[PDB]
Structure 1
Amino acid sequence: MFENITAAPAKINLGIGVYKDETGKTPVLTSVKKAEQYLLENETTKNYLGIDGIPEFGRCTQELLFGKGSALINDKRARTAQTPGGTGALRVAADFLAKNTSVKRVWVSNPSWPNHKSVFNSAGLEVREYAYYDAENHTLDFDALINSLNEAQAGDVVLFHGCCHNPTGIDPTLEQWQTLAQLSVEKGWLPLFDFAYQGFARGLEEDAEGLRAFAAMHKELIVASSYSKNFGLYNERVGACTLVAADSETVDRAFSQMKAAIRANYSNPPAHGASVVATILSNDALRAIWEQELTDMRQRIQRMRQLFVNTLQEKGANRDFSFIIKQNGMFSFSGLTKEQVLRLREEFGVYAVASGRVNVAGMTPDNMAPLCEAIVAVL
């Protein structure tokens, strides 16, 4: 059966995918440790969660996404399933859409996270790309984006990164999100928000502005969110798939099929990480400690963005890198070519992805001068 299977395709780490602190560690957040000790002391069973996971986790997720007092929440228009990470939320969404709707195609930005194509194709959905990145101004090529998406038909899904676009760190402005929201309603797209970095651009509420501008205009949308980065809970697989429909009767009926797609995949979701999140978000004291830890991560990344720009200038780059200051989250394109990236790895032991994307959170005050010296050497 297996004998002819084809194999699947495939000093400083800026090619890393997680946050690192100033010491180069990815420690467990203190709010998380305190929550884990509470769970150790208080859990009395590991009995299965429901298919959609812990109710409090869903409520706290919808409040983070839509805002407390949102009409979507008051009108009971949203249902949330706790999932194994943001990736599990995207796959549950894809399997739900493939089996229960006429969707055939999902539009993803060029560039995006490479796993988007794999997830949607796994569910039998085609992936099409829309333009996104203006590499001369290192900005959002909004006109190209809109022009690309005019090829999208009514009933196609359009995927939007909610904030901290991966890999570019370039997000729509609020006004651009409002223009996209209007266009999406006019063209009949189903928005799918991928929200893996809430809190890493400007703040929890600010980072949800774009999603909330869409939610104000749409009857229907799906959000695949992740707590991997903003709780430092990567390996516990903590995410959510939130389905929104015009009204409670419709969302409840549609969500029953989302639960069927979960049941046929992994049955019900892993409790530990989500219970940590629910414990933190629903407790005033733990939530305050966590919100500050997230602010500390967001601010450290901003300090590294500024220190990277300043240091490249001090090391004689003689090139404008100011675009780095304005970009959001852990990732940016450095503007280096694939061969410069290869040179950086081979000659200097500095590791980035071939696109030139770097994880700014991999930078520290200690490793900045050698990193920048290496980059200047390959310009």
Structure 2
Amino acid sequence: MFENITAAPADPILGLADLFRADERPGKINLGIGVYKDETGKTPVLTSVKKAEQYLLENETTKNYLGIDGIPEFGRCTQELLFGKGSALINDKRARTAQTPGGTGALRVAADFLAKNTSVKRVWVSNPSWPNHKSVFNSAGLEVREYAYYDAENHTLDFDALINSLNEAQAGDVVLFHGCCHNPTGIDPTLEQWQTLAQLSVEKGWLPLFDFAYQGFARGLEEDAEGLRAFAAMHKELIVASSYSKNFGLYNERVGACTLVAADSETVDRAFSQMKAAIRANYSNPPAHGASVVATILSNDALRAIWEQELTDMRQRIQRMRQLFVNTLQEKGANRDFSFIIKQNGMFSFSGLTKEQVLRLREEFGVYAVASGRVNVAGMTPDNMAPLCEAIVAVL
């Protein structure tokens, strides 16, 4: 059966982690995967989630199966985080959310749903985008086409080319938007550019799929959800795939949500029974621990307060690391002006490094960046900033 199965290519993000760790050069720098690191090079489990975990350890009586859609508490808090407390879609009972294994699991459940219950043949995804978007949507059967997005010379969002790109998208096509902290560019629409796109998918008939992995990392939790809320005020139907792996530092527990919105509660609940039938045919019901923790933290005035401060410290430490990196690069001999990365949002810096600058950096300096030139700024600390900038300016 398995004799002529070819070996798959390694994952462009995760394949790095395999190589990094097998390397026994002592001064290597990771900058690959997109996990926060603190000033000391470590990804601690947050304190708000250690208190919540002690709590579940004292207060759980059963591990008996969650419903197909998970913890209801988790569901309404996620909807409030996305749409706002007292939003009109919450009140009209227009949204239905399923707890999922991370944002990837929410993105696939969406894809599986749409493939067997919808007309959609095409998902539109930005150029550039998360590398695994294409792989999740092709596995469901859907075709992935690309729209323009980043102007590389000017280091801006190329809004016009994004508009003219999408004029080849039909009514009935999915268009994926990153909510904030665009992965990989970190370049996001202004509010004014999002209400322009809000209005345009309304007369073009696109179904919006918002991907939210980094809410809380660009300006703040509410500030980051504005673009989606500009679409939500206008659209009868949306879907958002949300992840709490980054903002909760809960990466390996796999906590996310696929939230469905239709024109009214009857349609949304009818559509939701199919989405739940897709979830059953894949894994059965979602992993409890991680979602259990999000919901304990968001249900507690005190424990929520502590998380929101932990998330603000991260937002700020990455911002500090950005200015540091453009300053250090400067005085380390930097051949170009890298000041544009200051204006980018989130964990990443989309540097202009070529695939070979990036290959040379791993294979002789041991600093790991994705082959697109995406480097994780949250993986930089004041101790490794100098090694790292000396490596980039010797490859320039």
In the superposition, the TM-score normalised over structure 2's length comes to 0.95
The equivalent residue for 1:331 is 348
Shift of 1:50: 0.6
**Count of matched residue positions in the alignment of Structure 1 and Structure 2:** 379
* Structure 1 contact 184–190 (Cα < 8 Å) conserved: yes
Farther off after superposition, 125-134 or 340-349: 340-349
Gaps of 5+ in 1: none
Shift of 1:16: 2.8
Farther off after superposition, 155-164 or 17-26: 17-26
* Structure 2 contact 178–212 (Cα < 8 Å) conserved: yes
Separation in 2 of the partners of 1:302 and 1:206?
17
Separation in 2 of the partners of 1:311 and 1:72?
47
Separation in 2 of the partners of 1:332 and 1:133?
13
Separation in 1 of the partners of 2:311 and 2:141?
37
Farther off after superposition, 158-167 or 366-375: 366-375
* Structure 2 contact 36–347 (Cα < 8 Å) conserved: yes
Shift of 1:331: 1.1
- Among the aligned pairs, what percent are the same residue? 100
RMSD of the alignment, in Å?
0.8
* Structure 1 contact 334–356 (Cα < 8 Å) conserved: yes
Shift of 1:319: 2.3
Q: Any idea what SS the aligned residue of 2:209 has?
A: strand
Separation in 2 of the partners of 1:355 and 1:4?
31
Gaps of 5+ in 2: 11-27
Separation in 1 of the partners of 2:338 and 2:84?
35
* Structure 1 contact 333–356 (Cα < 8 Å) conserved: yes
* Structure 1 contact 162–211 (Cα < 8 Å) conserved: yes
Q: 1:58 aligns with which of 52, 64, 75?
A: 75
* Structure 2 contact 120–173 (Cα < 8 Å) conserved: yes
Shift of 1:377: 1.3
Separation in 2 of the partners of 1:192 and 1:375?
36
Q: Any idea what SS the aligned residue of 1:212 has?
A: helix
Farther off after superposition, 9-18 or 259-268: 9-18
Residues 309-339 of structure 1: CA distance to partner in whole angstroms, max 9, x if unpaired? 1111121215221111110001121111111
Farther off after superposition, 231-240 or 338-347: 338-347
* Structure 2 contact 34–378 (Cα < 8 Å) conserved: no
Residues 185-230 of structure 1: CA distance to partner in whole angstroms, max 9, x if unpaired? 0100000000010001110000101110000110000000000000
* Structure 2 contact 34–348 (Cα < 8 Å) conserved: no
Residues 32-83 of structure 1: CA distance to partner in whole angstroms, max 9, x if unpaired? 0000000000000011111110010000000000000110111110000000
Separation in 1 of the partners of 2:184 and 2:47?
28
In the superposition, the TM-score normalised over structure 1's length comes to 0.99
Shift of 1:4: 2.1
Q: Any idea what SS the aligned residue of 2:210 has?
A: strand
Shift of 1:17: 2.5
Instruction: Determine whether 1:307 maps to 2:307.
Output: no
* Structure 2 contact 95–268 (Cα < 8 Å) conserved: yes
Q: Any idea what SS the aligned residue of 2:125 has?
A: strand
Separation in 2 of the partners of 1:356 and 1:296?
26
Shift of 1:344: 1.4
Separation in 1 of the partners of 2:101 and 2:390?
40
Instruction: Determine whether 1:162 maps to 2:179.
Output: yes
* Structure 1 contact 158–189 (Cα < 8 Å) conserved: yes
Farther off after superposition, 8-17 or 265-274: 8-17
Residues 90-128 of structure 1: CA distance to partner in whole angstroms, max 9, x if unpaired? 000000000101011100001111111110111100000
* Structure 1 contact 16–362 (Cα < 8 Å) conserved: no
Q: Any idea what SS the aligned residue of 2:387 has?
A: helix
